[PDB]
Design a protein around this ligand. Structure first.
Ligand code: AMP
Ligand code: RI2
Ligand code: RI2
Ligand code: RI2
Ligand code: RI2
Ligand code: RI2
Ligand code: K
Ligand code: K
Ligand code: K
Lengths: 322, 322, 322, 322, 322, 322
């Protein structure tokens, strides 16, 4: 109930997409629990516990699709709950929250570096890589492959409505990587000159399906058509535990004004609806490998990743639950 | 040569895409040769012949990909050239041109209403139709189905870079037709709820291939993946003669600042190139039917349409050449 | 208005499927106009003309899907109308009707013999042929191939709900042809031992799509999956002229009691609906050749067949129209 | 050996398909070994051991294709065999058998309710579900989605030769669920209006393949053609151990008179054979998920389910052998 | 009965593949007929007519698969037979033969030249072209493209068993075209670097299937897999008139010593059979265009080449027949 | 530094392909290490350890593509290195090496035997089997099946460039198995008569792709096209641990004189380059099963073979490294 404003700002910024990208939203949420814990004026363990739960709920209710966010909160809160129910004093519980958040953040960073190291080995001298949206994990791969001295070019799709491709383009450019910027529509037209595809992931399912920025499935489709390897770069905390037990991932429908700006949209007739899904789902047949910090896998081994790391917790309710 | 201003203004406006759509471009090309003949001050027939030769060369060098443009110029100038070589005096030559051009414009209008009526019979009540870009022909089909009392909805894809989807959305919505506007990247995500795809053409080749707005081949591809019918609404003047003798269609590369505005692009790193192809090429196997003013065809019958309407002219030179 | 009962019985028998099969229904309808004409008590040409029109309407309104029926009636009635409007006396008009019907019947028979002769050449010694429903044209092929001394076996699908396969099985057996009878569901399971598929057609469209007995499209689908040639055996009067101008073929929905017998069906809860489509539509991609009396064609050449034989009449209303 | 009558009556009833469905067969197999142990008059443990050995051999030789049967027998007899070899006295051996069998029956029931709850989460409100044959597991999924308030309709395919579709149609309709009954041949025609396919399994192989009622592979095939999800509701006791070591599953050929009744078939020509396979084999690539009581898997994870639940037993002999 | 030396040498050189390549073979058979007429010591019309009839049969009975050969003998003998039946005297008949063969040969050289010109237009600067066997018409395309100043590289598949690829590689090298030579099995491995596939044909059928050197089908298949264009370079006398009326093309089975040499094969166990198909059949779905001397067709328009250039003769027997 | 004669002969025999076949090569490298330890005149532990390290590098540097080789050197040197670091004396170290090589070699012979037994079960009486190259493990399957009394026939693809298929054909003949020998290009032509495809592997990756003799991929592709099962017979030491961490397998490019002999190649134009890839890569989607000595897997479970038998060593450097 005495929730610090750093939690409230992180939430608003997640919603507004000032903080965006699956890994980043996750790190931002770990962070927010950290700050809440650091700054809490609680006197009993029970008071802090309550704050961490209510803050976790606020943070969870921001954006649904990327499972990295709930996974970050679970990492922190599985540990916090266990300390709490085990009778931890106020300070043991504060540190358990703070240090758990710190680990997630630190492991998130090492996981992305490691993915780049692993992914890069699948890039070859002279490769033309097509990507989509802005993925820290995808970019780690392309960036490392350049640093090894491979001469790559990267086709960057624009990624409407939010123009994520601009970010990716400028960022790749600044590491010395040449870029070809194209609109989303042109992905089939350039698939013939493309040697590899490398994209990120918001959530990966028990069957190997990849939920990622709207348009990912199209690029994968025509990549398959063309026999261009589709490689997805993704941390194990992108894997979705609830889909083990039959859960479908919700696809976020964002405001129509991200597609068509406010001033214009209200001049339009009432019988036009603008629909703005932030993600689509890419079937496993169309994915060559998923690149995790633990190694290369075929998409269908998503279940192993889920079994050995996340399944244990599916008997329990969420660690923030009241 | 004394070229009248309406010839130059039309060429500017085609190049700038102020005038756009392969059907319109073609009518305006004819309209321009008509205005040249109307206002010419030529004394001799040879004087006027030369004006129209040159006028045609100006118009032909505007935009290369939609063969409708040269087929309009040809429709007028084969006639003008035969009048002139067969000894026509001046005012005979002036009317051959005027009248040939009025013929093309009125047949063009006719063909579109006719493609509407034919193509509508392949629209079923309840259908959800996905379309791309803005095509007077495709719209004729959708609008004619609506006027028949069928309850349709049209999925209008945005169509970057130039936003042609906005024109389409507003146009259809203004005839009463419910519209759903989405980004091009959302085509696959919404292909499951789509019953029919209806699109235009700029060029159609001997072998069946359809050159139409960039992103057309993606929509068609994922329509095939899902067994949604891809119907191309296209006049016979969209069919490309030189492809019979082995020609590939030039795919127009338009200025990059149509993608990223000048103000923003000049601030971007030197090693990003923006590539802006205006069109892509959809293979025949992803096309179900081509709705011409002469009836429904399989796309492989493109060659029949060309054999019987264009072949004769191929042993000759272009009717505006020296 | 003074319509003979032979017209009324032929109609009832077409509806009830006592007379069934596309070619046969067509011959039966030609026949019926013949008898009407033979037995008419008309005294003026105008009186007979009226009878032939009203009889054509009755016969046309029996079953929609197989276009052979309207084509048979057009063959007879294009000729009758032309005699009539050209001032034929009563007897000239009677004979025009009678003799036209006779030609259609005679040409129908020669067309089926000729298809068998042509089709059989595509069967090879040792072939295992899978078929579907009961097609006179298909059977003509298999029968001729045996008579040439090729040792074939024919897999006969049962063809529910009406058990057409029983007819085909007994009929092939009686020519010396060994038969393997299987239920419809088993077609994929036996496609591996199948060398050829040979089926009939009720209506063939401008784009090469084949409308035929329910389940045809499944057999073709898994045939394609397996690279087994799908050959359709079909007379040129199976080709559908209205689909040139964008008409979709109606798919006949027959009584639910053909699926589930009356005594049983009325014991069932109201919230079960039985749906009984008599046909499905098979796309051209899944058809290797159509075998007509005029020769082997790829499915997509359906338009040539339609252009050169049926298109001339599409400017006119139906020759029975009032 | 003194085999009790309920062992023989159950074997007759499995063979005749009076008792049917791989789940039921398996429970009744266990039920029979339970009744044998209940009523045995054995004095020694060795006497009873031998009765159960023989009882198991009788039950195992009824119907070969659904591995659920032997997995039930194994579940009981690995336990009984270990009790006996580990010196158990008589009434200990009698209870090991009884209790092992009650265990299997109650776990089987549990697994089905559980597969209902998991699989329902992949059913979305509004969905039209196509199913095949009659599967308690598939029905558990569909019924559980309905109880959640989702408005579904189920397309029940008839399922020749034995008409299992009638059982399914009546069952689902009796829980309130709207049913559409069609013939197996209509599967493709109605795949366009279908959102999800839900079916059972009799055996599932190491590599992912699903053996289920004849016609299953057709439905799955055309589901893939249209990108409709194929979900297999199947317990872990449906998974086939011997396939790990290279075994192919025997596909049961049932008496031809189930297709064509004795009265009719005896009148048919000698060179028609009726072939009645009871099952077909659907490849893994046409399967989206397998819903087990342990959660959603990709079909290629069949091998994991077998490794961790069945592999150990493969170096041993069958637990009812000499 | 009095057949010239040359007809025998031509025949034998064709049998042993000393003269080879569909077009060349046909030229050699026209040449033979031409020399039979030149050197005839016949004095009656009927004596010559009989020499030419027999000469034809000898030639037609060398090698079955390439229809070019009978199409050449028909070109000559149709004309010879029309003259002989007109009552043409000896010297008129002798010239009919002599001239018709020269007309055939000259039109053949012209077609291959024109195919080069037309086909070259579909080659683009920087293209890598995979070919197969040695096709004069395929080579015309490649050579003309290279002469146009396009920097192409050609991948020459070795083409077992007769090592045809060595001839192709040496030939293209000799015009200054960089060749990559590879074994047949490597065609998929290098399909990713291939932009275009260009190959010949021995026979093209009524449905658009292409019969060419063994392996042609594997290359078309993996080319389709990767969306590389397959372009067939083929004179209109490669199209097979018999296939219109149902015939299948005979696939010539040549000597096993062309595979395993005689000195080695004789030492091998009896129970190894060496099979040497000289050709295979590529379906039209894997073929993008056929480049003929009349233009570009989709494979499905082969029926038109046939309808319009050959169908007239099918009514009749082969000209050389009695 | 003091390396035995035999290590050099083994190395050179492997380089020149005198010793060939992935499994055999590996046995030859274990053998070499075994003879280095046997014949060492070293007197300190460290002297031997250094001989074996160097011997290993020599061997690993012969042929890159078949991972069996390093997996054998690892089997031995992991064990040798654990001993040397335990402080093992000279003779203990010498035995560690000698025994570990014998263990490797004996386990290899056992695996190939067990693969035969397991793989044979998926062969059925009357099967026609296409194979490629010469794989000891593929042959084990075929031989065991034939020994079981199944009347099989084997199609042996010739396998250029090194004529591997002659070895296979002679070998299978020698066990009494009828062979059909065909050139590589004929694999599609005979895929219709093929029931089963059985081939070896040199390296199998973490995502299930198979690296085997050049051509393997063309056969898998057309086998998939026709729904023929592709079964790979492969010892678990064919699985590539490096591919888990991102590596690509190096495709060995061997001498051009293995393609075109030296006496002939030297006469050829400079501008023909002869490319000799010894291997290609088959994707997992075209592979039905991998038959290992631990059982049948889908190709996607290759990651499990790896996770569980090799992943432990990836943390560390190669045993022979300093
Ligand atoms: N050198 C290599 N090492 C490991 N995997 C490879 C290599 N080359 C190709 N692949 C894989 O092999 C398959 C190639 O398939 P395609 O893209 O269809 O050629 C894919 O599954 C790739 O991941
Ligand atoms: O974790 P990293 O690799 O940064 O990003 C993964 C994915 O998350 C992003 O979505 P959004 O911008 O949050 O809507 C993009 O879809 C991207 O592919
Ligand atoms: O001729 P209509 O049917 O109106 O449209 C035909 C096509 O021409 C347009 O190109 P652009 O906007 O001129 O670049 C669009 O691609 C459209 O589909
Ligand atoms: O075990 P449950 O899930 O109820 O059904 C599993 C399968 O077993 C049945 O076979 P049969 O009717 O015994 O021949 C059907 O094929 C059904 O899908
Ligand atoms: O007429 P051109 O285009 O030269 O060759 C056509 C085809 O004929 C040849 O066969 P063969 O060498 O006669 O056995 C080759 O297969 C070639 O592709
Ligand atoms: O171990 P086994 O199963 O015998 O053979 C495995 C594979 O290794 C061989 O290559 P190479 O002859 O070494 O170049 C063949 O390609 C074969 O399929
Ligand atoms: K590419
Ligand atoms: K749809
Ligand atoms: K659907």
């Amino acid at each position: 109930a005495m929730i610090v404003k750093e939690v409230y700002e992180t939430a608003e910024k997640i919603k507004s997409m000032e903080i965006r990208g699956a890994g980043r939203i996750a790190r931002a949420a770990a962070q927010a629990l950290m700050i809440q814990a650091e700054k809490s004026k609680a006197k009993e363990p029970e008071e802090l516990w309550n704050e961490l739960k209510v803050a976790s709920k606020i943070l969870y209710n921001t954006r649904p699709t990327a499972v990295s966010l709930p996974n970050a909160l679970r990492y922190v809160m599985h540990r916090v709950k266990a300390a709490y129910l085990g009778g931890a004093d106020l300070e043991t519980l504060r540190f358990t929250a703070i240090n758990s958040a710190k680990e997630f953040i630190y492991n998130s960073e090492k996981a992305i570096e490691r993915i780049g190291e692993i992914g890069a080995k699948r890039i070859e001298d002279g490769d033309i890589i097509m990507t989509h949206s802005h993925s820290k994990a995808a970019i780690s791969v392309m960036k490392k492959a350049f640093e090894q001295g491979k001469n790559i070019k990267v086709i960057v799709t624009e990624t409407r409505p939010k123009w994520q491709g601009k970010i990716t383009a400028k960022e790749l450019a600044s590491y010395g990587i040449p870029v070809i910027y194209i609109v989303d529509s042109a992905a089939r037209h350039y698939m013939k000159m493309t040697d590899k595809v490398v994209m990120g992931a918001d959530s990966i399912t028990a069957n190997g399906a990849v939920i990622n920025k709207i348009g990912t499935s199209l690029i994968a489709l025509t990549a398959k058509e063309h026999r261009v390897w589709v490689m997805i770069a993704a941390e194990t905390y992108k894997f979705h535990p609830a889909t083990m037990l039959g859960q479908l991932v919700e696809i976020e429908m964002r405001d129509p004004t991200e597609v068509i700006p406010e001033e214009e949209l209200r001049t339009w007739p009432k019988n036009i609806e603008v629909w703005n899904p932030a993600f689509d789902v890419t079937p496993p047949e169309y994915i060559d490998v998923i690149i995790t910090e633990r190694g290369i896998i075929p998409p269908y081994a998503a279940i192993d990743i889920l079994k050995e790391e996340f399944g244990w917790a599916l008997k329990y309710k969420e660690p923030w639950e009241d």
